[PDB]
Ligand binder design. Sequence first.
Ligand SMILES: OC[C@H]1O[C@@H](O[C@H]2[C@@H](OC[C@H]3O[C@@H](O[C@H]4[C@H](O)[C@@H](O)[C@H](O[C@H]5[C@H](O)[C@@H](O)[C@H](O)O[C@@H]5CO)O[C@@H]4CO[C@H]4OC[C@@H](O)[C@H](O)[C@H]4O[C@@H]4O[C@H](CO)[C@H](O)[C@H](O)[C@H]4O)[C@H](O)[C@@H](O)[C@@H]3O[C@@H]3O[C@H](CO[C@H]4OC[C@@H](O)[C@H](O)[C@H]4O)[C@@H](O)[C@H](O)[C@H]3O)OC[C@@H](O)[C@@H]2O)[C@H](O)[C@@H](O)[C@H]1O
Ligand SMILES: OC[C@H]1O[C@@H](O)[C@H](O)[C@@H](O)[C@@H]1O[C@@H]1O[C@H](CO[C@H]2OC[C@@H](O)[C@H](O)[C@H]2O)[C@@H](O[C@@H]2O[C@H](CO[C@H]3OC[C@@H](O)[C@H](O)[C@H]3O)[C@@H](O[C@@H]3O[C@H](CO[C@H]4OC[C@@H](O)[C@H](O)[C@H]4O)[C@@H](O)[C@H](O)[C@H]3O)[C@H](O)[C@H]2O)[C@H](O)[C@H]1O
Ligand SMILES: [Cl-]
Ligand SMILES: [Cl-]
Ligand SMILES: [Cl-]
Length: 727
Amino acid sequence: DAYTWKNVRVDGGGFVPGIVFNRKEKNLAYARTDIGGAYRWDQSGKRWVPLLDSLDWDHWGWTGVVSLASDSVDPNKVYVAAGTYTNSWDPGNGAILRSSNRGASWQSTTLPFKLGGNMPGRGMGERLAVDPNRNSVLYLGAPSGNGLWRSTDSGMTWSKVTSFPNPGTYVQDASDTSGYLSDNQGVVWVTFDERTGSSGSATKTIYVGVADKDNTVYRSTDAGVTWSRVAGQPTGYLSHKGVLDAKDGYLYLTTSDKGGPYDGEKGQVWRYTTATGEWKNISPMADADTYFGYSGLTVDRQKPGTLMVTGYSSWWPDTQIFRSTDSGATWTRAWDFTSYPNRSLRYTQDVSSVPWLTFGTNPTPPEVTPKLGWMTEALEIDPFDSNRMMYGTGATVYGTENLGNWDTGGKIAITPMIRGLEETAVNDLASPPTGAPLLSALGDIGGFRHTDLDAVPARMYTSPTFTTTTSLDYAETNPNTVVRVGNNDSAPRIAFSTDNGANWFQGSEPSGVTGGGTVAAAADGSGFVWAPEGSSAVYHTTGFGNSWSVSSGIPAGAVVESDRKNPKKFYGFKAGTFYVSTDGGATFTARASSGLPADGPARFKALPGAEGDIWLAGGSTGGAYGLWHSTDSGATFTKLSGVQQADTIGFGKAAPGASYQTLYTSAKIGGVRGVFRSTDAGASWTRINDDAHQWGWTGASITGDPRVYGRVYVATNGRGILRGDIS
Ligand SMILES: OC[C@H]1O[C@@H](O[C@H]2[C@@H](OC[C@H]3O[C@@H](O[C@H]4[C@H](O)[C@@H](O)[C@H](O[C@H]5[C@H](O)[C@@H](O)[C@H](O)O[C@@H]5CO)O[C@@H]4CO[C@H]4OC[C@@H](O)[C@H](O)[C@H]4O[C@@H]4O[C@H](CO)[C@H](O)[C@H](O)[C@H]4O)[C@H](O)[C@@H](O)[C@@H]3O[C@@H]3O[C@H](CO[C@H]4OC[C@@H](O)[C@H](O)[C@H]4O)[C@@H](O)[C@H](O)[C@H]3O)OC[C@@H](O)[C@@H]2O)[C@H](O)[C@@H](O)[C@H]1O
Ligand SMILES: OC[C@H]1O[C@@H](O)[C@H](O)[C@@H](O)[C@@H]1O[C@@H]1O[C@H](CO[C@H]2OC[C@@H](O)[C@H](O)[C@H]2O)[C@@H](O[C@@H]2O[C@H](CO[C@H]3OC[C@@H](O)[C@H](O)[C@H]3O)[C@@H](O[C@@H]3O[C@H](CO[C@H]4OC[C@@H](O)[C@H](O)[C@H]4O)[C@@H](O)[C@H](O)[C@H]3O)[C@H](O)[C@H]2O)[C@H](O)[C@H]1O
Ligand SMILES: [Cl-]
Ligand SMILES: [Cl-]
Ligand SMILES: [Cl-]
C-alpha cells in the first residue's frame, strides 16, 4: 500500500516569526516557523506548502528555522538556517539547508555551533542573507558569541568572518540555569545595499545588526573585509530589523529595549540617510507614550516613501500597526483612542474561515476578539503589489488585499492567510468508535472535536477553556462521555462532556494541582483517574469529579490509562514499574517491572474489546527501548524482539480477514526510524511513511481509526495532526 498524507484541518495555531517575499519574482514568498519548518506560498490556492517534512527523527532540531533567504538573482534558490536551541535541549549543531527548486528538496551543511530557531530573539532578522549582485556570497549572523559567518560558494561551506569586531552582548536573563534565557542573542540581521555591487561582483556595502544596546549597527564598505560601527547611531536599544529603501537612500531601524518575541517595553524608529550619514528619530509615538518595542519593519518597494512598522509587544488593548507615506515624517495607525478608553478602527477583520480565532473569550472594551494581533514581529508589504500585506502573530498569519484604502481614508479588510500552514504541538489524540472521527489535545489553542477532518472546527474546547490540553479520554462503551485535563493559571484543569465533546462542563480539583498530567476514563463512563502535575498523589472520582480521593499505591505523576473492557480496571506506569488496580482506581499495586524501560518517557494503551491486553512503547538509549505486550493485565510483559526502539503505540480497524486490530507505532525497526503498521499483532511490520514525510520528533501520540482500515493519525511537535490513508 502506498500512503497519502495530509493534515487534519486546523489552520495555524502558533507563532510565525518571519515572512519573506522574493524581490525578483511576483508571488514568490515563504514563511518560517520556530518548531515546524518552513513554507512556500501557493498563490493559486492561497495557501502554504510545507517544505521541511523530510527532516527526520535524528534531525528534529533542524525543524527550527531562525532565518530564511530567497535568492533575488536566482529565484529557484532558497536557504534556511536550521537548529532549535543553543542549550542542552537540542543535542545537534545547526546547519545551513540549501535548495535549488524552491524547497522541494534540500542539501545540508552542518555548522560548528548550535542555532536558535526556538530561542529568545528569534523574531529579529533576517540574519541569513544572499548577496543581491554575486549570489554565491552569503552571510549568517550567529548566536552565543560566534559572531558573523560567511560562505562564498552558495552556502556549501562556511567560515567565520574574523574581522567582525562585536559578536553581541545582550542576554535576556543571565541567571537562568537551564540556559534557555541566558544566551548571547548575538548577530541578528544582515542587509545589503544592492546599489554598491554589479552583476558578478560582490556587493561592497553591508549593514549588520548586533544585539548590543551600545553598538546595534555595523557597516562594511569594502565587501566585508573591514567593519566599523555606524557613527552617530542611537544607543540604549536593540535593532530588531534594518531595512533599506534604495531608491531614496534611507536605512530604517526598528529598535526595542528587549530581544523579544514576548517582551519589549520601550523602543524607537530611526532613519539613516546613506548618502550623508544623517540620523533622524522618526518614532511614531513620543517616548512617554510608548510602552512596547518596535519591529515589523517593511518598505513598499513599488512606492518608495511608504513604510510600515509594528508595536510588536503591545499586549493591550491590541497590537499596533503604523504606516507612513512620507519616509517617516508623519504616521497613521491601525486604531486610535478617541475618548479614552474608546477606540477608532482603520480596519475590519473577518475570521469566518478560521472561526476558532476568537479563543472563546468575551473581553472587556476596548479589547475585542479576535485581536488585530500580538507578537507581530513579522509584517511585510508585497514587493509586487502595494495593496497586499501579510503579518504574523502568536496564532496565525493575517493579510489584506486592499491596503491602499488606508491611504485614501477607508478601511482595509483583514482575513487569515494561513491555510496549509499547520503549526500545533499535538499532545494526545483519540478516534472513538462512534461520534466525531477525532478529538485533539493541543498546545496554546486547547484542541478540538473534529466533526469533519477536512474542515476547520468552529471552536476550540470551551467552558472551560484550557491554554493547553495534555491528555484526554473517552468511555469505550459510550463515547458520548469524554474527559480532558490541561494547563491553566487557575482552576479548573479538568473538564467533562456527555455529548461526545460538543459541550463541556468543569469538575472540582484535588489538592495541589498545577497542570494537566494524564487522565483516564472508566470503560462505562462511571468514574475517572487523574494524575495531575504538581499534586502529591494520584486521585480517583466516581461521577464527574465532584469528590476526589487519593489512589493509594501508585506514585504521583504516573502515566494513567483505563482498561477498555473492565470498567473497574485501571493502569499506571512510572520509572520502570507497572501498576494495576481492580477497584476503579481506589488502590493500585506494583506488578511487572522486569525488563520494562526504566529510563525516559513511555506511552501505553489497553486494547479495545479485550480486558487486560496492554501495549507499551518507550524507553531511551539510557536503558531498555522498544515495544512490549501483556495479555494478563500487566502481570507479565513480553518485549517484541524485532522492534529496536519505539515511542508511541495505537490501534485501528482490523485488515480484511485479520484476527486482530491493526497496530501503528513511531518506532525504529530494521534499522529505520519511521511510522510502522502491523496487521498480524506485531509479528511483522511495514513502513507506511517515507523519507519525504517524517516530521521530526513524533514521540507524543499515535492512533488508528476503529472505523477506517489503514487510517492513522500522527501527532507532531509543530506540524499539527498528520493523517495517513491508503491511496
Ligand atoms: O515538547 C515537550 C516534550 O518534550 C519532550 O522531549 C522531546 C523534545 O524535547 C525538546 C525540548 O522541548 C521543550 O519544549 C518546547 C516544546 O517542544 C515546543 O513545542 C514549544 O514551542 C512553542 C513555540 O516556542 C512557540 O513559539 C509556538 O508559538 O508554539 C509552540 C508550542 O507551544 O516550546 C517548548 C519550550 O518552551 C520554551 O521555549 C519556547 C518559548 O516560546 C517558551 O516561552 C519557553 O517556555 C518556557 O519554558 C520553560 C521550560 O522549562 C519553563 O517552563 C518556562 O516557565 C516557560 O515559560 C522542553 O522544554 C525541553 O525540555 C525539551 O528538551 C528535552 O527535554 C527532555 C527531558 O528532559 C528532562 O528529563 C531528562 C533530564 O536529563 C533533563 O534534565 C530534564 O530536563 C530530554 O530528555 C531531551 O534530551 C531534551 O531534548 O523534542 C525532541 C525529543 O528528542 C525529546 O524527547 C519531553 O520528553 C516531554 O516530557 C515534553 O516536555
Ligand atoms: O488584562 C491585562 C492586560 O492589560 C494590562 O493590565 C497589562 O499591562 C497587560 O499586560 C495585560 O495584557 C495581557 O498581558 C499578558 C502578557 O503579560 C505580561 O507581559 C507584560 C507585563 O507588563 C506583565 O507584567 C506580564 O504579566 C498576555 O499574556 C500572554 O498571552 C498570550 C496569549 O494570549 C493571546 O492569545 C489568546 C488571546 O485570547 C489573547 O487575546 C492574546 O493576547 C501568550 O502567548 C502565547 O504564548 C505561547 C508560549 O507560552 C509560554 O511561553 C511564554 C510564557 O509567557 C507563557 O507563560 C508560557 O505558557 C506561544 O506558544 C504562543 O504562540 C503565544 O500566542 C503569552 O505567553 C502570554 O504571556 C495577555 O494575553 C494579555 O491579555
Ligand atoms: Cl479546496
Ligand atoms: Cl475594496
Ligand atoms: Cl512525557
